[PDB]
Amino acid sequence: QPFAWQVASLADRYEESFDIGAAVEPHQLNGRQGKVLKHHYNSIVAENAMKPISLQPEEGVFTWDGADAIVEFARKNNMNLRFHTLVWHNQVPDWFFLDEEGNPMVEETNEAKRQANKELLLERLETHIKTVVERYKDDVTAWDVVNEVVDDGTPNERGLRESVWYQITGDEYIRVAFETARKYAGEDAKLFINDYNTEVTPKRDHLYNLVQDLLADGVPIDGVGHQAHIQIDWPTIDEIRTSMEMFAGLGLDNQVTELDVSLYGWPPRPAFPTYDAIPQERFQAQADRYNQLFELYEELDADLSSVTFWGIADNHTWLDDRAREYNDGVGKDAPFVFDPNYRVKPAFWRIID
Ligand SMILES: [Mg+2]
């Protein structure tokens, strides 16, 4: 199979439908990775460099190096940039949720004091968002304002994930994150609520009702980010379609934000020990899946503005961690259309045609 830079550009192929993006790390902006990026994509997102704890690890202490390098890459290569992410319950500094006495706010029992912690947390969120937006508003083309605020089950009637943000502020942190993002980014900035398993119920319906409710109260939400951490047979093409159509019906835009097609089910066990151990049947099944997937994206391209892969080539993917985690430290997945050596896979040909 030829190298990725010897085949037709994915970005050019879908230029009339949607952007083609990739999650990157500061150290993958040169060499073959950089070459592949410039050749196939017209959009990028920080895999980790822009999460909360990565920008303000200590209150008032901002670390912009990683993010600036990614932003600089985007500028020089004229690529769009998704910002991931302003709010999340993971990879977020503990100081956010500590009261003025240094005790975790979730422990406070005085109603009035809890009310005071809510306002303090929100003020801190406002400051984080404002600081970040002011620095990157001219480079960001899409913001993952909040990330995974919806639960996979139904712990509460609204299906909201009961993270530390919810425990301390209910749904206000979501309202504030969006309202603040709009304030400092401008009316033209596209604000998204990102999440995984947006194709399955009840989660899909919980997210749906959430955006409706918020939109009714004037909260500025422009689109839904579909992480799309999917499998070869799940979710079904129809589940994907139905979900995107529902949000499109509300006037919201859609974006596939962290796409990877695992060769395994869940959990990813048993997984193949190495890449060479993977039989061709697997790559062919993945190929048929990618074809169906991108035909769908194309069909719905009026309500889909961007499709980002959570990685570039099979040599670097968080799916390998999940694989090792469930196969006693050994396991290899292969979610992309480019292999560990940056050579095209059967899936590439099925989505370039
Ligand atoms: Mg095809």
From TrEMBL:
Tell me the pathway.
Glycan degradation; xylan degradation
Note the Gene3D superfamilies from the entry: Glycosidases (3.20.20.80)
Q: What is its EC number?
A: 3.2.1.8
Example of a GO MF term: endo-1,4-beta-xylanase activity
Source organism superkingdom: Bacteria
Q: Which residues form the active site?
A: 258
Q: Which PROSITE patterns match?
A: GH10_1, GH10_2
Catalysed reactions listed for this entry: Endohydrolysis of (1->4)-beta-D-xylosidic linkages in xylans
Positions annotated to bind Mg(2+) 1: 17, 301, 304
The segment(s) forming the GH10 domain are 4-353
The residues the record assigns to binding Mg(2+) 2 are: 291, 350, 353
* Enzyme class, broadest EC rank: hydrolase
Q: Which UniProt keywords apply?
A: Carbohydrate metabolism, Glycosidase, Hydrolase, Metal-binding, Polysaccharide degradation, Signal, Xylan degradation
Q: Which family does it belong to?
A: Belongs to the glycosyl hydrolase 10 (cellulase F) family.
Query: What name does this protein carry?
Result: Beta-xylanase
